[PDB]
């Protein structure tokens, strides 16, 4: 079964970021999540003290040698990358995706879908390493900050979100979600953009909004991208984005009743009540 | 108080250790704080096994982060599995004692420490022989232990081959200072279609309550079965008496192994095919289609 994801993200012992945010949602949707933990930390960088291990290039290549030797690389219908924060591993991830595409092609499986979440910040070696890696991505899910530093466009509205996304397409990513940005002219909403470049050279663009909740939520992007992989498996990307927005709105609203209790409403991870309208742009 | 500190292996491919334990505990509504003792490509059954192993310094470094952030009083359960590093196995007793003091300081009930002495299977030790003695020393401080028949045999020095020898091995654990022991499976000479298990509970009077039951035997070597079993045991023992928790965990394992077979993971299939289908039936991890009888012995 091609519900098999290689997830190259952070591990934390306490709290829900990276593979701790992504794994439970995807497993609940029936995906096998094969995680490579780029770091193994006590907690996310919110808490006063962070301790633990950071993968180097040699550790990443050693793990790859085990996967390659046991003939697993053809298993990965999906590659999902998040937190890496290491120029040499970001570069090596491109080789890993190319090796997975090759192995799947030779076994006549459907081409892998590489979802690249370019995790860098919010609110240069690594920025440039993501500009190269994104030349081989199928889907990118930048926050507004990552989209701004990668494209060099300040994402502050729909016009500037479109310019940023056009940069991604020219770089070679066909499908972009800028997950949220604030609007001076609409203070109670966050807007998202789904941009799809065809092949024809043409772009289909889709937009919509979610309520802007007061406060700062950790792991939101991480749950979002994992949810997007789950829904986009069987739903067109526009409806996949709507469902994924619906899941985050359920989780944020539940917290309101900073850490997302990702494991607390399994029902809502699979079938949210919030589903965001995702409407084609003319 | 549905928070677990789980000290186990991480594998990228397949279902053993923390990956196998975390999904069921999450479905049962537990927060699983996982310390990954190793980060490997796959379990040891495969021809090639690659990745990183913690040393004592890496383990104490994580513990410092959990301490500094005041997380230790959160842990109502500690569950240890694959460690296979004498120094880290030795350090578990101090970790548990530190969690116990932190809980008392916050007016919380005592933690329950579940020690799965993960050392090997099928007559084969995974790593160095010095790990055996380290587990004898840690088990004195365990509330609950869940050896396979191989682990029960090398720890106690008794070949666990039947009910009589399982009971002798279990008595060794009680003498060592482990009050509650599950020897998860062993052979019945007179019944090759079932596996027998033992639950032994030492009080206090110094009296022992013993229970036994059987599960259907499936022809084939499955791995990760003990890991799902101990995760299920923690989950059900939170709100059931230990004997019923054992029967529910045995029922979880029966559904999970039948699902593995149904999806092609027969005796003769590849190691990859025989990997447990942990994500196939989430409902059956919480609510197994059967519950094994756990019946008192004389
Ligand atoms: N304050 C907020 N109010 C409402 N939804 C939010 C808020 N912050 C995040 N989200 C939701 O979470 C998703 C991902 O969060 P975002 O901040 O875009 O990414 P990241 O967490 O990677 O910085 C958004 O698409 C949106 O659905
Ligand atoms: N081949 C099998 N047939 C039936 N049940 C099995 C089989 N292998 C494992 N089990 C189930 O899995 C549980 C734990 O597996 P066991 O082999 O005893 O532990 P471990 O995985 O630690 O070696 C058993 O108690 C039993 O319920
Ligand atoms: Ca954000
Ligand atoms: Ca993010
Ligand atoms: Ca076994
Ligand atoms: Ca004791
Ligand atoms: Ca075991
Ligand atoms: Ca009960
Ligand atoms: Cl706008």
């Amino acid at each position: 079964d091609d519900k098999h994801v290689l997830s190259i993200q952070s591990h934390v012992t306490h709290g829900y970021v990276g593979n701790k945010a992504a794994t439970f949602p995807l497993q609940l949707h029936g995906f096998d999540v094969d995680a490579i933990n780029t770091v193994s930390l006590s907690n996310h960088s919110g808490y006063p003290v962070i301790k633990g291990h950071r993968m180097d290039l040699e550790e990443f290549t050693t793990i790859m040698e085990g996967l390659r030797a046991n003939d697993f690389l053809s298993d990965y219908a999906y590659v999902l990358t998040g937190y890496i924060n290491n120029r040499d591993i970001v570069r090596q991830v491109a080789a890993t995706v190319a090796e997975i595409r090759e192995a799947r092609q030779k076994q006549g499986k459907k081409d892998a879908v590489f979802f690249c979440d370019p995790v860098m910040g919010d609110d240069e070696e690594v920025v440039e390493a993501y500009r190269e890696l994104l030349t081989h991505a199928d889907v990118a899910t930048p926050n507004y900050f990552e989209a701004s530093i990668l494209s060099t466009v300040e994402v502050k509205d729909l016009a500037s979100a479109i310019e940023a996304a056009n940069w991604f397409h020219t770089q070679g990513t066909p499908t972009v979600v800028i997950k949220s940005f604030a609007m001076a002219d609409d203070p109670t909403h966050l807007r998202f953009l789904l941009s799809c470049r065809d092949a024809t050279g043409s772009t289909k663009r889709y937009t919509g909004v979610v309520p802007y909740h007061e406060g700062r939520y950790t792991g939101t992007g991480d749950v979002f991208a994992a949810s997007l992989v789950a829904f986009a498996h069987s739903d067109p990307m526009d409806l996949a984005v709507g469902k994924a927005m619906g899941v985050l709105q359920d989780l944020i609203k539940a917290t309101i009743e900073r850490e997302l209790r990702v494991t607390s409403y399994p029902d809502r991870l699979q079938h949210p009540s919030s589903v965001a309208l995702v409407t084609p742009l003319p």
Side-chain angles (χ1 to χ4, degrees), chain A residues 90 92-109:
Chain A
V90 168
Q92 191 65 42
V93 165
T96 300
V97 164
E99 198 180 352
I100 286 159
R101 294 196 193 287
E102 170 230 13
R104 289 197 59 90
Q105 172 155 58
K106 286 162 85 173
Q107 298 287 299
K109 301 188 204 313

Side-chain angles (χ1 to χ4, degrees), chain A residues 83-86 88-90 92-109 111-122 126-150:
Chain A
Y83 188 95
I84 301 165
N85 194 24
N86 176 309
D88 291 320
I89 298 168
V90 168
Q92 191 65 42
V93 165
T96 300
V97 164
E99 198 180 352
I100 286 159
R101 294 196 193 287
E102 170 230 13
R104 289 197 59 90
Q105 172 155 58
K106 286 162 85 173
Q107 298 287 299
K109 301 188 204 313
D111 192 31
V113 186
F114 172 23
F115 284 79
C116 180
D117 187 354
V119 176
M120 297 180 290
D122 218 357
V126 165
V127 186
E128 198 63 12
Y130 270 112
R131 287 189 190 102
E132 281 314 325
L133 179 63
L134 286 168
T135 65
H136 326 281
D138 298 297
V139 181
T141 64
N143 66 19
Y144 78 84
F145 175 78
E146 290 147 353
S148 301
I149 68 158
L150 285 158

